[PDB]
Every structure is written in structure tokens, then in C-alpha cells.
Amino acid sequence: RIDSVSQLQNVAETTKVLFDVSKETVELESEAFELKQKVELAHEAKAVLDSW
Amino acid sequence: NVIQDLYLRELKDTKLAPSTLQDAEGNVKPWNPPQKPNLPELELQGPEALKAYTEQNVETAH
């Protein structure tokens, strides 16, 4: 029974860490949307120029 | 001799050719600006989702 208990003790703290970590990662992708539009603009500009 | 005759004749008699920028436009892609600089959508606001989630999965540890 002690063996079961010890596992759960360590889990209780550490899971809160993962919880934060996941949301932090997601934030980076929000900012990635700004990046994505930059990628697009570069592609379009190069394409028109290539045709010229 | 003949070299000079051709050289002279060509150079002198043609030195303008057609060149309309407008005709060029038809043959190239148009620049138009990006669309949808849309800000991300916000979801899963409040602990409403969390309280629901703690309850929802019966197995919280087995």
C-alpha cells in the first residue's frame, strides 16, 4: 500500500508542471500565426517577381 | 566592307523596337496583398471545462 501512496505524492505536484507547460507551448503557436502570414507574404512577392 | 555595310545599315536604320509595359502586364502575375491576418480564437475559458473534466472521467487514477 505504501508503494502505491508514494507514487501519487510525487505525481500531485509534477502534473501541475505539465499542465502549465502544455499551455505555454500553445501560446507559442498563437504567435506562430503571425509568422505564418509572414511566410505567405514572402512567397507571394517572390512569385509575382519571378513572373516579371 | 560588306561587314561595314551591314553594320552601318542595321545600326542606323533600327535602334527603336516596340516596348509597351502595359502589354507585359498581361503576361505576368499581379501583386495583391495578404488576406486574413485573423487573431486566434479563444476557447476553453473558465474552470467550467476543468470541473466538468475532473467529474467526466470517472477514472482519475486506477
UniProtKB/Swiss-Prot annotation, chain A:
Localization, per the record, is: Mitochondrion; Mitochondrion inner membrane
For molecular function, the Gene Ontology terms on record are: proton transmembrane transporter activity
Q: Name one GO biological process term.
A: protein-containing complex assembly
Which positions bear Phosphoserine? S4
UniProt keyword Phosphoprotein present: yes
Q: Which UniProt keywords apply?
A: CF(0), Hydrogen ion transport, Ion transport, Membrane, Mitochondrion, Mitochondrion inner membrane, Phosphoprotein, Transit peptide, Transport
GO terms for cellular component: mitochondrial inner membrane; mitochondrion; proton-transporting ATP synthase complex
The entry's other comment says:
Present with 12900 molecules/cell in log phase SD medium.
Q: Which family does it belong to?
A: Belongs to the eukaryotic ATPase B chain family.
Function of the molecule: Mitochondrial membrane ATP synthase (F(1)F(0) ATP synthase or Complex V) produces ATP from ADP in the presence of a proton gradient across the membrane which is generated by electron transport complexes of the respiratory chain. F-type ATPases consist of two structural domains, F(1) - containing the extramembraneous catalytic core, and F(0) - containing the membrane proton channel, linked together by a central stalk and a peripheral stalk. During catalysis, ATP synthesis in the catalytic domain of F(1) is coupled via a rotary mechanism of the central stalk subunits to proton translocation.
How the protein assembles, per its UniProt entry?
A: F-type ATPases have 2 components, CF(1) - the catalytic core - and CF(0) - the membrane proton channel. In yeast, the dimeric form of ATP synthase consists of 17 polypeptides: alpha, beta, gamma, delta, epsilon, 4 (B), 5 (OSCP), 6 (A), 8, 9 (C), d, E (Tim11), f, g, h, i/j and k.
What's the name of the protein? ATP synthase subunit 4, mitochondrial
The organism of origin for this protein: Saccharomyces cerevisiae (strain ATCC 204508 / S288c)
Say which residues of the entire protein are included here: 141 to 192 of 244
From Swiss-Prot, chain B:
Q: Coverage of the whole protein, first to last residue?
A: 33 to 94 of 124
Its main localization is: mitochondrion
Q: How does it assemble?
A: F-type ATPases have 2 components, CF(1) - the catalytic core - and CF(0) - the membrane proton channel. In yeast, the dimeric form of ATP synthase consists of 17 polypeptides: alpha, beta, gamma, delta, epsilon, 4 (B), 5 (OSCP), 6 (A), 8, 9 (C), d, E (Tim11), f, g, h, i/j and k.
Extract the coiled-coil ranges from the record.
Answer: none
Organism of provenance? Saccharomyces cerevisiae (strain ATCC 204508 / S288c)
Q: What is this protein called?
A: ATP synthase subunit H, mitochondrial
Q: Further remark, if any?
A: Present with 6140 molecules/cell in log phase SD medium.
Please name the GO terms of the biological process aspect recorded for this protein, alphabetically: cristae formation; mitochondrial proton-transporting ATP synthase complex assembly; proton motive force-driven ATP synthesis; proton transmembrane transport
Q: Does the keyword Transmembrane helix apply?
A: no
In the record, the note on similarity to other proteins reads: Belongs to the ATPase h subunit family.
Keyword tags: ATP synthesis, CF(0), Hydrogen ion transport, Ion transport, Membrane, Mitochondrion, Mitochondrion inner membrane, Transit peptide, Transport
| Role according to the record | Mitochondrial membrane ATP synthase (F(1)F(0) ATP synthase or Complex V) produces ATP from ADP in the presence of a proton gradient across the membrane which is generated by electron transport complexes of the respiratory chain. F-type ATPases consist of two structural domains, F(1) - containing the extramembraneous catalytic core and F(0) - containing the membrane proton channel, linked together by a central stalk and a peripheral stalk. During catalysis, ATP synthesis in the catalytic domain of F(1) is coupled via a rotary mechanism of the central stalk subunits to proton translocation.
Q: Tell me if Mitochondrion is a UniProt keyword of this record.
A: yes
Cellular component (GO) terms are: mitochondrial inner membrane; mitochondrion; proton-transporting ATP synthase complex
**Which pairs of Cys residues are joined through disulfide bonds in the record?**
none
Cell compartments where the protein resides: Mitochondrion; Mitochondrion inner membrane
